[PDB]
Motif scaffolding. Structure first.
Motif, mmCIF file in Angstrom:
data_model
loop_
_atom_site.group_PDB
_atom_site.id
_atom_site.type_symbol
_atom_site.label_atom_id
_atom_site.label_comp_id
_atom_site.label_asym_id
_atom_site.label_seq_id
_atom_site.Cartn_x
_atom_site.Cartn_y
_atom_site.Cartn_z
ATOM 1 N N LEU A 256 -48.341 -50.786 -38.940
ATOM 2 C CA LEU A 256 -47.483 -50.104 -37.975
ATOM 3 C C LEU A 256 -46.257 -50.956 -37.635
ATOM 4 C CD1 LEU A 256 -46.875 -47.745 -36.284
ATOM 5 C CD2 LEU A 256 -48.650 -48.410 -34.641
ATOM 6 N N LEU A 257 -46.460 -52.268 -37.561
ATOM 7 C CA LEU A 257 -45.387 -53.191 -37.230
ATOM 8 C C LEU A 257 -44.369 -53.232 -38.360
ATOM 9 C CD1 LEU A 257 -44.050 -54.971 -35.312
ATOM 10 C CD2 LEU A 257 -45.681 -56.797 -35.817
ATOM 11 N N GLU A 258 -44.854 -53.288 -39.593
ATOM 12 C CA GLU A 258 -43.962 -53.234 -40.743
ATOM 13 C C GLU A 258 -43.146 -51.931 -40.791
ATOM 14 O OE1 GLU A 258 -45.874 -53.489 -44.540
ATOM 15 O OE2 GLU A 258 -44.039 -54.126 -45.574
ATOM 16 N N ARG A 259 -43.757 -50.810 -40.411
ATOM 17 C CA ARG A 259 -43.069 -49.519 -40.466
ATOM 18 C C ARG A 259 -41.912 -49.439 -39.487
ATOM 19 N NH1 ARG A 259 -47.091 -44.329 -41.260
ATOM 20 N NH2 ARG A 259 -48.081 -45.050 -43.205
ATOM 21 N N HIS A 260 -41.852 -50.385 -38.560
ATOM 22 C CA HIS A 260 -40.764 -50.416 -37.599
ATOM 23 C C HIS A 260 -39.990 -51.741 -37.694
ATOM 24 C CE1 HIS A 260 -43.292 -47.106 -36.336
ATOM 25 N NE2 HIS A 260 -42.344 -46.673 -35.528
ATOM 26 N N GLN A 261 -40.050 -52.332 -38.884
ATOM 27 C CA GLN A 261 -39.209 -53.464 -39.268
ATOM 28 C C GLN A 261 -39.547 -54.736 -38.524
ATOM 29 O OE1 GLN A 261 -37.609 -52.624 -42.128
ATOM 30 N NE2 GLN A 261 -38.836 -50.871 -41.429
ATOM 31 N N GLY A 262 -40.774 -54.807 -38.024
ATOM 32 C CA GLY A 262 -41.209 -55.950 -37.248
ATOM 33 C C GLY A 262 -40.628 -55.907 -35.845
ATOM 34 N N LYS A 263 -40.177 -54.736 -35.414
ATOM 35 C CA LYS A 263 -39.698 -54.600 -34.045
ATOM 36 C C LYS A 263 -40.827 -54.060 -33.167
ATOM 37 C CE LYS A 263 -34.800 -54.338 -35.233
ATOM 38 N NZ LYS A 263 -33.470 -53.704 -34.924
ATOM 39 N N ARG B 155 -41.513 -53.287 -29.858
ATOM 40 C CA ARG B 155 -41.512 -52.166 -28.919
ATOM 41 C C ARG B 155 -41.210 -50.820 -29.581
ATOM 42 N NH1 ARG B 155 -37.981 -53.645 -24.104
ATOM 43 N NH2 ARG B 155 -39.119 -52.290 -22.633
ATOM 44 N N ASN B 156 -40.388 -50.839 -30.627
ATOM 45 C CA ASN B 156 -40.173 -49.643 -31.432
ATOM 46 C C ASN B 156 -41.471 -49.174 -32.079
ATOM 47 O OD1 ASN B 156 -37.427 -49.548 -30.829
ATOM 48 N ND2 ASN B 156 -36.869 -50.774 -32.634
ATOM 49 N N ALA B 157 -42.243 -50.132 -32.591
ATOM 50 C CA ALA B 157 -43.547 -49.859 -33.192
ATOM 51 C C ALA B 157 -44.584 -49.329 -32.182
ATOM 52 C CB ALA B 157 -44.072 -51.102 -33.892
ATOM 53 N N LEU B 158 -44.491 -49.764 -30.929
ATOM 54 C CA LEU B 158 -45.432 -49.339 -29.885
ATOM 55 C C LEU B 158 -44.950 -48.070 -29.174
ATOM 56 C CD1 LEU B 158 -45.923 -52.990 -28.675
ATOM 57 C CD2 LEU B 158 -47.846 -51.620 -29.565
ATOM 58 N N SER B 159 -43.912 -47.454 -29.748
ATOM 59 C CA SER B 159 -43.446 -46.099 -29.417
ATOM 60 C C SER B 159 -43.396 -45.789 -27.922
ATOM 61 C CB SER B 159 -44.291 -45.047 -30.164
ATOM 62 O OG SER B 159 -43.712 -43.750 -30.093
#
Ligand SMILES: CC(=O)N[C@@H](CO)[C@@H](O[C@H](C)C(=O)O)[C@H](O)[C@H](O)COP(=O)(O)O
Lengths: 293, 297
Positions: free
Chosen positions: B284-291, B293-297
């Motif tokens: 999930l973290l990779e899918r948001h480029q290691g960002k 808070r973006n990953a934690l939606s």
């Protein structure tokens, strides 16, 4: 619980903001630093006067710190011989962990209270010298022990820190406290605190050297011309101070061993080199006094 | 005296003609008033600084490095900013590098002629294998230091993105570089003493270039730098603290999650806030480029 360690509420969303917003925010915080120094002007002013006094008694300006602070100390000191013509001994930057610590880490350097003793002793730190301890936190043990040793010898001690009522401040005769507020990236003292430290150090050396006569009007008359820009600036400086031409400025500079202050003295006094040297010495290199008399 | 009269950096400051007669407090107050001009000068540079940061971030993502060159104080400030990056951001020493005219000899004292030597910059850049994937930032107050000029030319000839930072407008350095940053701080208090306002402006700009670029690579949770890999005892304590600070959890959960995440604080933070296991959290973290808070939606 220290200010340096606190989170900054204006940067809480920095991990999701645009490139422009982040740099805008940083630039905004940057405006806080010169204001923070402004509160410190009286202490800084007292520091300079005491430094000048110590310079006049043969003492040196000694900076100590670890990491970024130590590097800033070295940076400021580096520029004194080429700008003001003084020896490398006059203003010395000491950094925790020695020469390599300028670029590289040194595990435990900031916590080594034994090494600062060795570092200061190997330069024969004395009662006549002035010690400036630099640490944003105000509690770096390496700096604390350094300050303690200096105080024990009866030397003047100056602390520069970014937290109020630090241990460094308590020990030091003069406490410069640059309250710059919580950093944009939590704990990143290299940012505002580093910027403040550079501003303060720049003042301690520039102002003290101006007062020792290491300039004339606002001209860098003691510059050491080690490159094309500087060689051209020396000629320029002689022309600015005397209203003479390029030919006469180069000629005199040559005769004065590239010493623009001496050259100016020679031209505005019609004296010979040796006599201009004599009069300058007798007025402690203060060109204005040497010409006034 | 050549063309130095044309450059703001070499001009006299009206406010300091009598500075050798001013009182100590007048001197420091003036230096302080002039310091206020510096963040203002940098304000007008924010769009160019932004462009530069965005370029640097691409380069970092393409495996490129951020390379600083300068002489004297400029060089030293490049070295200063680069030296801070591994501990501040948990990155490799290669990622941001500071090169200074005259090498290690110039770090504490001037090196005679170094800023003039246009051959030496070629050797210095080649010795660190400077390539078209790297970003070169040329740092010079005057905007005309030949060492730095030749530096940029060489970089440009390679296809590398080039950035200049100078204090005189329309400099030769600006002409060569793709992105020109022009910090007009006005004449120095001691004429030609570029270590002062220009040095301060340089430090501010460099600090933005590294700090903002690192934030864009996803190194942060809110305003905490969380990308720490607990490879030893002292990085572990730092990781535990940052995991605790980010998630408001206790020492117990932070230490346990650190273990399950293979000593990666950022992934540990991800696991705690998401309630996901290591492998899931990683995806999930990779899918948001290691960002985070973006990953934690
Ligand atoms: C003016 C002076 O007496 N000293 C400083 C700056 O105050 C200069 O450095 C000296 C010579 C050094 O080599 O240590 C300056 O840093 C370089 O000339 C870089 O000039 P620039 O490329 O436009 O940034």
């Amino acid at each position: 619980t220290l200010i340096t360690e606190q989170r900054n509420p204006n940067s809480v969303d920095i991990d999701r903001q645009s490139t422009l917003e982040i740099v805008r925010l940083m630039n905004e915080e940057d405006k806080l630093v010169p204001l923070a120094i402004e509160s410190c002007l009286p202490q800084i002013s007292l520091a300079v006067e005491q430094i000048v006094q110590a310079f006049q008694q043969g003492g040196r300006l000694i900076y100590i710190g670890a990491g970024t602070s130590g590097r800033l100390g070295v940076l400021d000191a580096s520029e004194c011989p080429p700008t003001f013509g003084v020896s490398t001994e006059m203003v010395k930057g000491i950094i925790a962990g020695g020469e390599c610590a300028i670029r590289h880490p040194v595990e435990g350097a900031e916590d080594n209270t034994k090494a600062v003793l060795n570092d200061l002793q190997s330069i024969h730190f004395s009662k006549n010298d002035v010690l400036v301890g630099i640490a944003a936190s105000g509690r770096t043990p390496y700096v604390i022990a350094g300050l303690q040793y200096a105080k024990s010898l009866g030397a003047l001690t100056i602390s520069i820190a970014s937290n109020p009522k630090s241990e460094m401040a308590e020990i030091a005769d003069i406490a410069i406290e640059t309250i710059v507020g919580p950093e944009i990236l939590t704990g990143s003292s290299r940012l505002k605190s580093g910027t403040a430290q550079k501003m303060v150090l720049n003042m301690l050396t520039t102002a003290s050297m101006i007062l020792l006569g290491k300039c004339y009007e606002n001209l860098m008359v003691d510059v050491q011309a080690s490159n094309e820009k500087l060689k051209a600036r020396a000629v320029r400086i002689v022309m600015q101070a005397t209203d003479c031409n390029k030919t006469l400025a180069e000629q005199t500079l040559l005769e004065a061993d590239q010493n623009a202050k001496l050259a100016i003295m020679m031209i505005l006094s019609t004296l010979s080199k040796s006599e201009a040297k004599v009069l300058l010495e007798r007025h402690q290199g203060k060109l204005r006094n040497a010409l006034s008399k």
